[PDB]
Design a protein around this ligand. Structure first.
Ligand SMILES: O=c1ccn([C@H]2C[C@H](O)[C@@H](COP(=O)(O)O)O2)c(=O)[nH]1
Ligand SMILES: O=c1ccn([C@H]2C[C@H](O)[C@@H](COP(=O)(O)O)O2)c(=O)[nH]1
Ligand SMILES: O=c1ccn([C@H]2C[C@H](O)[C@@H](COP(=O)(O)O)O2)c(=O)[nH]1
Lengths: 140, 140, 140
């Protein structure tokens, strides 16, 4: 698989690497210290820009450990990085703990980045849809 | 790629379109005005139904801008739209800001819809699993 | 498609099944009773371990009904289960309702598990990225 071009915007942030051979994501870091009070959110930079190939999408997922241990998550999760995006990747972090603030230092790992294929499809208006077993059963 | 049949249930909502050639998602709108007080959630309709082909899934992701700027997100994110679903697509919105209510008007864009392949696999019970390097290391 | 080896760690939890032929996910249950007070979170076990093949990822999504009806969600959503993981799958649940606690009993369905392909790519540092129409337009 062709590697993804990565631009290091911040010399103090390492190039992300895959920790185990089949791991879905690579770690993303914050380029700045932040204290996130309970219920508050903050947008931080990751120090990198990428050129994802057309046909793929980058997905920003919360880190599992910080989620369970501190309530740290991502407001717009899964964060959606489009193939044509050439800016710095940013993460919108939120503290879901009711009591304890979260302190993050520059260089701390804050999220993980997955790359997947996406169907670049068009939607064609029709007058009727075919029928299925599941039907209109759903709870939005 | 074969286009996806789309049924317009609401004549006041446009047919979604892909804004740039490789963008992962298309915009979804609310069919109704809502004011979402801090910490509250609401289920809104999008005015469309689709027939996704077997082998794919529709994913409802929060919009990036509204997430960072107002704290708007989706409670069940990523919202999972099954291939056999033939009802109106709905979005369960939540206001994660601690202070400021969010006002959305009919026609406002509230989320984005991605289409991806999904593995329709069966799970076979075994007595033992093979071993790996990562192991049982995880923080749920 | 080759079925996924599943290890039942808890004899009181059923083997997950796909409810309709094209449904994206299978149901995951909690192995324990929990009461989740408003704004609080809890890590529960699902009673199963799996061996996902290299090249895939397991994704833990909130259940749609409980999200809209009770505010139940997943803190690290989408929960990311790596191919090399051989431990018990766990779910970090959170109550986003401001008022009403959520009571879940052992055996209740709490989430859904999807399986998708993931691109196991490397990132190669470059000095410059190519240019696109979308550009650096984004709201993290
Ligand atoms: O954000 C969502 C999530 C689900 N659904 C619809 C389409 C799904 O296939 C159906 C699933 O609901 P349950 O069958 O899981 O209740 O609900 C939505 O409209 N929006
Ligand atoms: O919702 C989740 C997320 C992760 N994991 C497990 C499987 C993952 O591969 C492992 C990853 O945890 P870390 O290695 O990132 O700590 O934890 C879960 O059981 N449930
Ligand atoms: O978590 C996120 C989400 C989005 N983006 C960037 C890359 C996206 O393509 C662009 C999309 O933003 P809008 O064009 O949707 O405003 O923002 C991020 O850096 N981080």
């Amino acid at each position: 698989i062709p590697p993804i071009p990565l631009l290091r915007l911040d010399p103090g942030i390492p190039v992300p690497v895959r920790a185990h051979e089949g791991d879905a994501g690579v770690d993303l870091c914050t380029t700045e210290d932040v204290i996130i009070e309970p219920g508050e959110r903050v947008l931080v930079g990751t120090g990198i820009a990428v050129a994802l190939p057309i046909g793929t999408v980058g997905l920003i997922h919360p880190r599992s450990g910080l989620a369970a241990k501190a309530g740290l998550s991502v407001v717009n999760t899964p964060g959606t990085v489009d193939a044509g995006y050439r800016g710095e990747i940013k993460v919108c972090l939120i503290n879901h703990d009711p009591r304890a603030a979260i302190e993050l230092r520059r260089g701390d790992r804050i999220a993980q980045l997955l790359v997947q294929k996406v169907e670049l499809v068009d939607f064609v208006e029709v007058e009727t849809l075919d029928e299925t077993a599941r039907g209109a059963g759903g709870y939005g």
